[PDB]
């Protein structure tokens, strides 16, 4: 009855992969896509009850991806190969927006998980996990929506694993900490697939008996809005929850004067 859904989110920023191609490094985006497809094939391979949901997170929007080879696996891969080429051929950069729409893809994934869970037979239980791979820089404005996604996932108890390639993002660290997911940076991108298999592929119950790398320490410092500087103790607004390092009689954000005698 173990219905395990493995959600895959891909950092499809064209800028980072274009630069990497300019670097002519050992690892390319095609290798990342192949590794993702292999991981999904193995996930469906482990058990029939296991299901796969793959969504591509591109700057323009989020795309739902899904001869000696398994027929259903062959069809799924050719579908995915069709989807990625379809996106890339139509991938036109029109605008100065560079940050990946990380939050929106997560919201779409959560909605799909909810839809499938409603469709789950009541005789069976659906464990769901989301795997996200990080390549380009993190997004700044999506912080509120990212926190909302984290809160919703923790409410529905969905593990979220973040995989770092080049750029570390403390947001992903905190997300994995709160959600209980696994966070790790892979230095050898070509070896990356094994890190997915050795760590991300096993289920959390399986990971319990298995010996795992220790979790990375995560900080939760706060930046005071008037200068965005990290502090230890700060003054919090009782109205709009704004943080101020210096005592103020009037709040800047909610425009409320502090009634202190």
Partner 1 sequence: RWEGGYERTWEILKEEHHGQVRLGMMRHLYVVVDGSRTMEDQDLKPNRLTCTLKLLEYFVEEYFDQNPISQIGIIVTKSKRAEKLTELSGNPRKHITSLKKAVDMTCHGEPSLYNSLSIAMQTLKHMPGHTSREVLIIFSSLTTCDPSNIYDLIKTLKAAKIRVSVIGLSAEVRVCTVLARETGGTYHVILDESHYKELLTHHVSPPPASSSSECSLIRMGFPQHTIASLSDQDAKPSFSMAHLDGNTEPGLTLGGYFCPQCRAKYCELPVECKICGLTLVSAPHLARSYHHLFPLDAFQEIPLEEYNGERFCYGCQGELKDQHVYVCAVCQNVFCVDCDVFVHDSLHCCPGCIH
Q: Which residues bind partner 1 (CB under 8 A)?
A: 61-62, 64, 101, 103-104, 107-108, 110-112, 114-115, 118, 142, 144-145, 147-152, 155-156, 174, 178, 217-222, 231-241, 244, 247-248, 251, 256-260
In the bound state with partner 1, the residue whose beta carbon lies nearer, of 44 and 218, is: 218
- Residue 228 contact, options partner 1, Zn ion, none, Cβ 5-8 Å cut-off depending on partner type: none
Could you tell me the two tokens for 101?
């729409």
Q: How far is the CB of 156 from Zn ion (least distance, A)?
A: 16
Contact 5, 130 (CB under 8 A): no
Can residue 62 be called a binding residue for Zn ion (CB under 5 A)? no
| Helix/strand/coil for 162 | strand
In the bound state with Zn ion, the residue whose beta carbon lies nearer, of 199 and 251, is: 251
Q: Which residues of 178-215 are buried (b: 16+ CB within 10 A; e: fewer)?
A: ebbbbbbbbeebeebbebbeebbbbeeeeeeeeeeeee
In the bound state with partner 1, the residue whose beta carbon lies nearer, of 103 and 196, is: 103
Burial class (CB in 10 A: 0-12, 13-18, 19+), 164: buried
In the bound state with partner 1, the residue whose beta carbon lies nearer, of 15 and 243, is: 243
Compute the distance between CA of residue 5 and CA of residue 153 in angstroms, rounded to an integer: 14
The 10 Å Cβ neighbour count of residue 67 is 4
Could you tell me the two tokens for 181?
């997911």
Contact 151, 173 (CB under 8 A): no
How many residues bind to Zn ion according to rule CB under 5 A? 7
Contact 126, 3 (CB under 8 A): yes
Can residue 242 be called a binding residue for Zn ion (CB under 5 A)? yes
In the bound state with Zn ion, the residue whose beta carbon lies nearer, of 76 and 109, is: 109
Can residue 245 be called a binding residue for Zn ion (CB under 5 A)? no
Of the residues 21, 210, 223, 240, which one makes contact with Zn ion according to CB under 5 A: 240
Residues in contact with 171: Cβ distance below 8 Å, sequence separation at least 6, in sequence order: 138, 143, 146
Of the residues 237, 243, 245, 258, which one makes contact with Zn ion according to CB under 5 A: 237
In the bound state with partner 1, the residue whose beta carbon lies nearer, of 63 and 129, is: 63
- Residue 149 contact, options partner 1, Zn ion, none, Cβ 5-8 Å cut-off depending on partner type: partner 1
Can residue 226 be called a binding residue for Zn ion (CB under 5 A)? no
In the bound state with partner 1, the residue whose beta carbon lies nearer, of 65 and 196, is: 65
Can residue 254 be called a binding residue for Zn ion (CB under 5 A)? yes
Can residue 230 be called a binding residue for Zn ion (CB under 5 A)? no
Of the residues 38, 243, 251, 258, which one makes contact with Zn ion according to CB under 5 A: 251
Of 94, 87, 28, whose CA–CA distance to 54 is shortest? 87
Whole-number Cα distances in Å, 93 to 59, 61, 133, 229: 8, 11, 22, 34
Which residues bind to Zn ion, rule: CB under 5 A?
Answer: 237, 239-240, 242, 251, 253-254
């Amino acid at each position: 009855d173990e219905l395990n859904l493995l959600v895959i989110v891909v950092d499809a920023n064209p800028i980072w992969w274009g630069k990497q191609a300019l670097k002519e490094s050992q690892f390319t985006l095609s290798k990342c896509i192949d590794a993702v497809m292999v991981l999904g094939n193995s996930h469906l391979f482990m058990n029939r009850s296991n299901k796969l949901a793959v969504i591509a997170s591109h700057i323009q929007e989020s795309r739902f991806l899904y001869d000696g080879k398994y027929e259903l696996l062959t069809s799924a891969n050719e579908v995915i190969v069709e989807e990625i080429k379809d996106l890339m051929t139509k991938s036109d950069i029109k605008g100065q927006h560079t940050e990946t729409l990380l939050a929106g893809s997560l919201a779409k994934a959560l909605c799909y998980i909810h839809r499938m869970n409603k469709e789950v037979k009541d005789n069976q239980e659906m464990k769901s996990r989301i795997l996200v791979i990080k390549a380009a820089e993190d997004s700044a404005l999506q912080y509120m929506n990212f926190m909302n996604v984290i809160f919703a996932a923790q409410k529905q108890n969905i593990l979220i694993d973040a995989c770092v390639l080049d750029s570390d993002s403390g947001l992903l660290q905190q997300a994995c900490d709160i959600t209980g997911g696994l966070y790790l940076k892979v230095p050898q991108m070509p070896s990356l697939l094994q890190y997915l298999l050795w760590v991300f592929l096993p289920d959390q119950d399986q990971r319990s008996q298995l010996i795992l790398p220790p979790p990375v320490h995560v900080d939760y410092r706060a930046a005071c809005f008037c200068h965005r500087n990290l502090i230890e103790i700060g003054y919090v607004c009782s109205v709009c929850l704004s943080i101020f390092c210096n005592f103020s009689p009037i709040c800047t954000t909610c425009e409320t004067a502090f009634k202190i005698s």
